[PDB]
Amino acid sequence: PSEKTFKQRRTFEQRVEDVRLIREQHPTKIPVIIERYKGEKQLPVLDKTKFLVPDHVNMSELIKIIRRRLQLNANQAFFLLVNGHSMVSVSTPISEVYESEKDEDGFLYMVYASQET
């Protein structure tokens, strides 16, 4: 097992350089880190945590992709918290979410949990 998050496993400079390369090789993708909330207990762990998401995909669509990857029941509660906090618009394309919520290192960080607060 690894206890470390992506940010704790890669230096700031390594992450900035990852984003630059992804930017040049995938100009219409947003680089997103999706991790399980640090003490989450109902939801399983995702197999992978690092994704490229097409600019046009909105949060509603991303949520349903991740839920399906987690093999969740339709009724199970799930929230995807961007840059620390519940997103109010779910129609917004992720390219625009990125503009308001991207980290200083250039990644977009999300955590998933069974509740919003």
């Binding site: 097992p1 690894s2 992978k48 945590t49």
Partner: peptide, 24 residues
């Protein structure tokens, strides 16, 4: 979600290499 790949040395023969992949 971490992987450590070890190559086994001293393995002849021949053109095939052995790796032990530890996934933790």
């Amino acid at each position: 979600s971490i992987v450590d790949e070890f190559e086994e040395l001293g393995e002849q023969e021949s053109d095939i290499d052995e790796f032990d992949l530890l996934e933790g």
